[PDB]
Design an enzyme around this catalytic site. Structure first.
Site, PDB file in Angstrom:
ATOM      1  CE1 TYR A  20      -3.861  -2.079   0.119  1.00  0.00           C
ATOM      2  CE2 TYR A  20      -2.772  -3.207   1.931  1.00  0.00           C
ATOM      3  CZ  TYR A  20      -3.765  -3.164   0.968  1.00  0.00           C
ATOM      4  OH  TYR A  20      -4.673  -4.169   0.864  1.00  0.00           O
ATOM      5  CG  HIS A  25      -6.746   5.241   0.343  1.00  0.00           C
ATOM      6  ND1 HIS A  25      -7.530   6.366   0.163  1.00  0.00           N
ATOM      7  CD2 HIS A  25      -7.447   4.391   1.118  1.00  0.00           C
ATOM      8  CE1 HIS A  25      -8.633   6.209   0.847  1.00  0.00           C
ATOM      9  NE2 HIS A  25      -8.617   5.005   1.422  1.00  0.00           N
ATOM     10  CE1 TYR A  71      -4.023  -3.410   5.914  1.00  0.00           C
ATOM     11  CE2 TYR A  71      -4.271  -4.200   8.160  1.00  0.00           C
ATOM     12  CZ  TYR A  71      -3.677  -4.302   6.915  1.00  0.00           C
ATOM     13  OH  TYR A  71      -2.739  -5.268   6.669  1.00  0.00           O
ATOM     14  CG  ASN A  73     -11.556   0.027   7.253  1.00  0.00           C
ATOM     15  OD1 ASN A  73     -11.006  -0.286   8.311  1.00  0.00           O
ATOM     16  ND2 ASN A  73     -11.668  -0.795   6.220  1.00  0.00           N
ATOM     17  CG  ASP A  98      -6.428   9.392  -0.214  1.00  0.00           C
ATOM     18  OD1 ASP A  98      -6.228   9.222   1.031  1.00  0.00           O
ATOM     19  OD2 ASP A  98      -7.269   8.805  -0.877  1.00  0.00           O
ATOM     20  CG  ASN A 119     -11.656   4.062   3.589  1.00  0.00           C
ATOM     21  OD1 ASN A 119     -11.512   2.839   3.430  1.00  0.00           O
ATOM     22  ND2 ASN A 119     -10.697   4.908   3.233  1.00  0.00           N
TER      23      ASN A 119
END
Length: 196
Positions: A20, A25, A71, A73, A98, A119
């Site tokens: 990631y 993101h 993470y 969310n 972002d 999120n």
């Protein structure tokens, strides 16, 4: 804890893991990692607050840096307990993230308002409310809501990446104003950024 709108906590939003780190993101992680290197703030394992965090001096101010490792969310599971433990009011928080609603190479400082479907911010505003500052890093939008996932978990093409890198670099030069509580001037100077 915090003092007025002298920004004393800078949160970068993102996902953990090599898979990631280069995704759109993770724009907030890019900003905060680059800000930590700029000011020699160590970003260290902070299991207590489910993140990686630092503390150091930015232009004569004691500032904390936080990357949630929850993470995206679940970002609130790090940001909420961290900001409460150190008595940091939302008015002293900058969250870099972002922004789908802006072009690559566009970057804006926003005070308050909504998550606009983000999120990460969705997991934070319910707890501390909206009155923190946001560094909105343009990543562009993929068309439809079905594709938002594939866009934000995508690795931008080199042209788009360059435009974001330039905007992020610009923004690093304005953190001095933010930690000194000059939010209005910092907003004008960040928002005025153009890539070319």
């Amino acid at each position: 804890g915090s003092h007025m709108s002298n920004i004393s906590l800078i949160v970068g939003l993102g996902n953990p893991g090599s898979e990631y780190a280069q995704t759109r993101h993770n724009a907030g992680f890019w900003f905060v990692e680059q800000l930590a290197d700029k000011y020699g703030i160590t970003l260290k394992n902070d299991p207590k607050f489910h993140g990686i965090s630092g503390r150091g001096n930015i232009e004569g101010h004691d500032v904390r840096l936080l990357l949630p490792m929850t993470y995206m969310n679940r970002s609130g599971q790090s940001v909420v307990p961290f900001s409460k433990f150190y008595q940091i009011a939302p008015e002293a928080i900058l969250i870099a993230h972002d922004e789908l609603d802006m072009n690559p190479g566009v970057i804006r400082l926003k005070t308050g308002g909504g998550h606009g479907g983000h999120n990460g911010l969705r997991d934070i505003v319910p707890h501390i409310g909206p009155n923190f500052h946001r560094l909105r890093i343009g990543i562009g939008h993929p068309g439809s809501k079905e594709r938002v996932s594939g866009h934000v978990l995508g690795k931008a093409p080199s042209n788009e990446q360059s435009l974001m890198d330039g905007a992020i670099d610009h923004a690093l030069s304005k953190v001095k104003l933010l930690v000194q509580g000059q939010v209005p001037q910092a907003m004008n100077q960040i928002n005025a950024y153009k890539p070319a």
